[PDB]
Design a protein around this ligand. Structure first.
Ligand SMILES: [Zn+2]
Ligand SMILES: [Zn+2]
Length: 756
């Protein structure tokens, strides 16, 4: 039994220098690893060359499923194993089996000897040599490992007793903490020969004034955290079976990659493993443009429900956590699907991880939490776009099924965002829904479809006005109590106010505070007294007469002071990111936006529309004038699926509607983001949009149909060829990016706009 500390390769192929630990102390040994390659070539027969001293054998391994490669043809996959030195030798000559005619692909040329040994042997490698006593012969030369190998149990890797050191930069098992590992390793060649545990905290920043205290504070924690670092490293390593020095702490996708790869190798499935490459290794077919792949990697938008209105019943605000893991755990013709066998392997892995995590296991809990992050990361190895598409498509179905399940009992969906769900209840008072909420939660959890979902009620709503997530108001209570009248807080988040003149913004809020009070009073009166929700009929009668007089007075003052240069500070229309409307009369916008909020009732249409006409009579405008219609003042630019590294939260960020302090900070935890990452994601969105416009399909203006010719003038129908994506849409999309890049300081995106 050997405790390998740091597997390390060198210039010579199939050579692994190992800083192993023998019962005495640390020592250096070397391993020899042959190269195993997967050949798909020809349709039948075999080369019969015999020139190479290798081992070939016809195999039946389960290949991946690239959408382009769909033809079955025949099966003659091979399992050629051949040492890497003579493989480099064979690279030289022109004639050889690996480079000849009728070669479909090489499937595992990317995996290095280091990875092969760390996946096959592991941390606890032992010697089962026996035969002749070549232990001395094995130690003087390089011990060839292919013939003799065994992996002993690693339940207890080490009882630690050893010296630890530091080496840090702020631009013996030493710990390397530097922004540039490669530069420091190359500059001091002697640093290579010593074993190092490489933990990298990067991007040191300074306030540029009085930086000595902050340098001292940044040094103190790194000095004092040594006991924690080694302890956590050993805690991960004892379960991981990866050697301590190869493993890193922040690296979490590597554990998933090794475990999934070795449990796949337990089966006959091919790895498709690819190293420092964002795309899978499919044998070389992955280096060509394909329409299906381009569509499946450009579909990251999630559906949503935004049923708007004013609700006089109670509304529940539940938060659905563990959606993706629940989706995975629960569950020829198709050319765009992931292999079912690997899917079942992943399902079994997640099930066993969850079961061990239930029994007080920290590492299993970490793996379960980090699986969702691993799925969407291309930089993680074994990453497949088909897997991401499969997971997203099943999650999309799961959310609709959950909404339908909620629809089984008397309730109505209002909103759905993968993290928040709003439910309309039949009951009228929040104090009478304690039992029904619990019953619904138990019923939802009882279903086998949603056994692993986490649901928690965040707020109870008494009166809610809903337009979208960025524009709402009402009265809410955090949690209902006993024998005490429930405390209610009034919330009002209106982005619509930001596009108003400074003199009218206070008026907007003041009049909304009267609308809400009147609606609450009339609802209480209707409840006390006993097609239309009669709780809210007649609320406008209380505040109509004051509103008319106030509007008249405001109009008179505007007529008096609009041309006064002294009052030029007022009556200035702000410029905001996503603003497109060019509008003239400031008080008209206030009255329109105030009436639009009342209009979302669906039960008091006539009453509100009479008041709207009467108010519009103060101005010289008619009830159906085009200038008197409400449009949303703001555009939208939504970047989907941004990761919080310290929170493990999936959030969709919209750069136009969302107010600041939210663009650059996570929601669950108030941790700031990194700006250049946001700029790079915006650039990715822009270039992807341009590509999607450039690869669109054509259609007939009358026969809505797809063009099936490469050279034609028009439809067999007398018509014309038009585009599925019109130019005006992409022009507007390029327009909004320019404003977003100028309101906030994004130099990289501004440069990208000007290089077009
Ligand atoms: Zn967070
Ligand atoms: Zn036609």
């Amino acid at each position: 039994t050997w405790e390998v500390l740091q597997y390390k390769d060198s210039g010579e192929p199939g050579v692994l220098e190992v800083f192993v630990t023998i019962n005495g102390k640390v020592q250096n040994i070397t391993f020899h690893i042959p190269k195993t390659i997967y050949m798909k070539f020809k349709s039948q027969t075999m080369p019969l060359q015999k020139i190479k001293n290798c081992l070939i054998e016809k195999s039946s391994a389960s290949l991946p499923n690239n959408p382009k490669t769909s033809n079955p043809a025949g099966g003659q996959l091979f399992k050629i194993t051949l040492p890497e030195s003579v493989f480099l030798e064979e690279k030289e000559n022109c004639t050889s089996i690996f480079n000849d005619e009728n070669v479909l692909g090489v499937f595992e040329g990317t995996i290095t000897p280091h990875q092969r040994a760390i996946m096959d042997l592991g941390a606890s490698v032992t010697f089962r040599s026996k035969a002749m006593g070549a232990l001395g012969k094995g130690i003087q030369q390089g011990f060839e490992m292919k013939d003799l190998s065994m992996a002993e149990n690693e339940r207890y890797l080490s009882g630690f007793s050893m010296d630890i050191g530091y080496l840090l930069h702020f631009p013996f098992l030493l710990l390397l903490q530097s922004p540039f590992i490669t530069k420091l390793l190359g500059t001091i060649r002697l640093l290579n020969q010593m074993p190092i545990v490489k933990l990298s905290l990067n991007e040191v920043l300074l306030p540029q004034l009085n930086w000595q205290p902050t340098l001292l504070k940044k040094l103190v924690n790194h000095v004092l955290s040594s006991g924690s670092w080694i302890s956590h490293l050993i805690k991960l390593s004892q379960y991981s079976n990866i050697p301590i020095c190869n493993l890193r702490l922040d690296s979490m996708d590597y554990i998933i990659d090794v475990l999934y790869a070795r449990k796949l190798k337990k089966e006959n499935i091919v790895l498709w493993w690819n190293e420092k490459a964002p795309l899978p290794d499919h044998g070389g077919i992955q280096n060509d443009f394909d329409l299906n792949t381009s569509w499946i990697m450009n579909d990251s938008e999630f559906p949503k429900i935004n049923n708007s209105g004013v609700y006089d019943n109670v509304v529940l605000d539940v938060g659905v956590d563990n959606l993706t893991v629940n989706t995975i755990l629960t569950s020829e013709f198709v050319h765009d699907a992931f292999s079912n066998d690997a899917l079942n392997v992943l399902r079994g892995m997640l099930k066993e991880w969850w079961d061990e995590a239930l029994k007080e296991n920290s590492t299993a809990d970490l793996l379960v939490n980090s699986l969702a992050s691993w799925v969407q990361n291309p930089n993680a190895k074994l990453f497949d776009g088909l897997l991401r598409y499969h997971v997203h498509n099943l999650t999309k179905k799961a959310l609709l099924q959950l909404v339908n399940e909620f629809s089984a009992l008397g309730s109505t969906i209002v909103y759905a965002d993968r993290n928040q769900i709003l439910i309309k209840t039949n009951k009228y008072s929040p104090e009478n829904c304690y039992a029904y909420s619990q019953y619904m939660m138990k019923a939802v959890r009882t279903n086998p479809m949603f056994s692993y979902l986490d649901l928690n009620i965040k707020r109870y709503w008494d009166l809610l006005i809903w337009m979208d997530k960025f524009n709402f108001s009402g009265l809410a209570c955090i949690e209902i109590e006993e024998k005490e009248n429930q405390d209610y807080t009034a919330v009002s988040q209106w982005q619509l106010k930001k596009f108003l003149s400074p003199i009218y913004q206070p008026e907007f809020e003041d009049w909304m505070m009267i609308i809400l009070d009147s609606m609450l009073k009339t609802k209480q009166s209707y409840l006390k007294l006993n097609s239309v929700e009669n709780s809210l009929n007649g609320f406008s009668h209380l505040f109509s007469k004051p509103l008319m007089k106030r509007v008249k007075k405001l109009f008179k003052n505007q007529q008096e002071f609009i041309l006064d240069p002294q009052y030029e500070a007022d009556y200035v229309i702000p410029v905001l990111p996503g603003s497109h409307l060019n509008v003239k009369n400031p008080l008209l916008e206030l009255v329109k936006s105030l009436c639009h909020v009342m209009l979302l009732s669906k039960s008091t249409i006539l009453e509100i529309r009479t008041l709207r006409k009467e108010l519009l009579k103060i101005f010289e405008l008619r009830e159906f004038a085009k200038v008197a219609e409400f449009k949303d003042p703001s555009l939208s630019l939504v970047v989907p699926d941004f990761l919080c590294e310290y929170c493990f939260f999936i959030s969709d960020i919209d750069f136009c509607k969302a107010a600041p302090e939210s663009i650059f900070s996570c929601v669950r935890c108030h941790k700031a983001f990194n700006q250049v990452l946001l700029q790079e994601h915006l650039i990715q969105k822009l270039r992807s949009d341009i590509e999607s416009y450039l690869i669109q399909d054509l259609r007939c203006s009358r026969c809505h149909k797809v063009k099936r010719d490469y050279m034609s003038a028009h439809c067999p129908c007398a018509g014309a060829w038009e585009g599925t994506l019109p130019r005006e849409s992409i022009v507007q999309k390029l327009n909004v990016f320019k404003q977003v890049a100028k309101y906030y300081g994004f130099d990289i995106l501004l440069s990208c706009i000007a290089d077009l």
